[PDB]
Design an enzyme around this catalytic site. Structure first.
Site, short mmCIF file in Angstrom:
data_model
loop_
_atom_site.label_atom_id
_atom_site.label_comp_id
_atom_site.label_asym_id
_atom_site.label_seq_id
_atom_site.Cartn_x
_atom_site.Cartn_y
_atom_site.Cartn_z
N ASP A 70 0.86 -1.18 0.00
CA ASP A 70 0.00 0.00 0.00
C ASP A 70 0.89 1.23 0.00
O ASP A 70 2.12 1.12 0.21
CB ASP A 70 -1.01 -0.04 1.17
CG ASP A 70 -0.48 0.12 2.59
OD1 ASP A 70 0.69 -0.22 2.84
OD2 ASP A 70 -1.28 0.58 3.43
N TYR A 72 2.84 4.85 0.76
CA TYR A 72 3.54 5.44 1.91
C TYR A 72 2.49 6.12 2.78
O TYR A 72 1.69 6.86 2.25
CB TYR A 72 4.60 6.45 1.49
CG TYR A 72 5.82 5.85 0.85
CD1 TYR A 72 6.66 4.99 1.54
CD2 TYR A 72 6.14 6.14 -0.47
CE1 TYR A 72 7.80 4.47 0.96
CE2 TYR A 72 7.29 5.66 -1.06
CZ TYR A 72 8.11 4.78 -0.34
OH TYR A 72 9.25 4.26 -0.90
N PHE A 83 6.50 2.80 -4.20
CA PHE A 83 7.85 3.09 -3.65
C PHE A 83 8.44 4.42 -4.11
O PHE A 83 9.40 4.88 -3.47
CB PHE A 83 8.76 1.88 -3.87
CG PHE A 83 8.22 0.66 -3.18
CD1 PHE A 83 8.36 0.49 -1.81
CD2 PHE A 83 7.59 -0.32 -3.91
CE1 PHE A 83 7.85 -0.64 -1.21
CE2 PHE A 83 7.07 -1.47 -3.30
CZ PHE A 83 7.15 -1.59 -1.94
N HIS A 193 9.21 -8.12 2.02
CA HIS A 193 9.07 -6.69 1.73
C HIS A 193 10.31 -5.96 2.21
O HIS A 193 10.90 -6.32 3.22
CB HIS A 193 7.79 -6.23 2.40
CG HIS A 193 7.34 -4.85 2.11
ND1 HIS A 193 7.91 -3.74 2.67
CD2 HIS A 193 6.32 -4.41 1.35
CE1 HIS A 193 7.32 -2.66 2.25
NE2 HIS A 193 6.31 -3.02 1.42
O1 LIG Z 1 4.36 2.46 -2.31
C1 LIG Z 1 4.65 1.89 -1.32
N1 LIG Z 1 5.30 2.54 -0.31
C2 LIG Z 1 5.64 1.87 0.95
C3 LIG Z 1 5.41 0.53 1.01
O2 LIG Z 1 5.67 -0.14 2.16
C4 LIG Z 1 4.73 -0.20 -0.05
O3 LIG Z 1 4.49 -1.38 0.04
N2 LIG Z 1 4.48 0.53 -1.18
#
Ligand SMILES: O=c1[nH]cc(O)c(=O)[nH]1
Ligand SMILES: [Cl-]
Ligand SMILES: [Cl-]
Ligand SMILES: [Cl-]
Ligand code: NA
Length: 229
Positions: A70, A72, A83, A193
């Site tokens: 998900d 940030y 990310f 992750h």
């Molecule tokens: O876009 C994201 N940002 C931070 C995360 O942990 C993730 O799974 N995805």
């Protein structure tokens, strides 16, 4: 640009609009969900205009899919590409610093200048999250609220294309897409992750970038140019 108001032909790239037809009502339902969150006095990230941003790069050009959990949860980090952060963001989120640590170990490139991953998106890497919104400061707060059907449809559509696909699935929520990647034109890399909470269980040393390129070349595809500025 509102998901509640406007159809996929307006919101996302043409290939994506057709790919996501099975979840057209579901995307409108997610628009209603975010309307209801605001009405109730809760916020969400990223900004509404960025929520579907991964689907504004061409469907037909995707060669690699990176899936996280998900967005940030800190205001000013999420930009609708998993990310990624805006090029003026510093310090980097800890997950992104860990991604770039593995990028340098794997590829031998210098640390990137900033956290903007748009070069990857512009080179056929889909930067997806299993769930496309979060409440500020509350990781996984929108799990189970209806995005999973949308990202499931996105993977199934990619996997059905007459084209090679490599998937990199970071963490348990992303891994729930593994069954839809069963077809012989698709191959999935799975690791823990890159979050500090999980990275030491197998994200570090996983060499996803060089592995994805060996897999693409093995299927007669061009490798990704991973190099960031
Ligand atoms: O876009 C994201 N940002 C931070 C995360 O942990 C993730 O799974 N995805
Ligand atoms: Cl809030
Ligand atoms: Cl893309
Ligand atoms: Cl191979
Ligand atoms: Na693309």
């Amino acid at each position: 640009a509102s998901m509640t108001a406007r159809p996929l032909s307006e919101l996302v790239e043409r290939g994506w609009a057709a790919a996501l037809e099975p979840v057209a009502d579901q995307v409108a339902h997610m628009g209603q969900f975010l309307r209801a969150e605001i009405a109730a006095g809760r916020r969400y990230l990223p900004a509404g205009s960025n929520v579907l941003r991964a689907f504004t790069f061409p469907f037909d050009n995707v060669r690699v899919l990176i899936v996280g959990q998900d967005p940030y949860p800190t205001p000013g980090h999420a930009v609708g590409l998993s990310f990624s952060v805006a090029p003026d963001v510093r310090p980097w989120p800890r997950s992104l610093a860990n991604i770039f640590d593995e990028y340098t170990a794997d590829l031998g490139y210098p640390l990137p200048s900033n956290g903007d991953l748009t070069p990857w998106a512009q080179r056929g890497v889909l930067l997806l999250n299993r769930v496309l919104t979060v409440r500020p400061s509350n990781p996984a707060s929108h799990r189970g609220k209806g995005w999973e059907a949308v990202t499931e449809c996105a993977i199934r559509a990619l996997a059905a294309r007459a084209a090679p696909l490599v998937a990199i699935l970071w963490g348990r929520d992303a891994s729930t897409l593994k069954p839809m990647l069963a077809a012989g034109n698709c191959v999935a890399i799975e690791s823990p992750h890159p979050s500090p909470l999980s990275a030491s269980r197998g994200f570090f040393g996983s060499r996803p970038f060089s592995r994805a390129n060996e897999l693409l070349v093995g299927m007669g595809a061009e490798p990704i140019d991973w190099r960031l500025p």
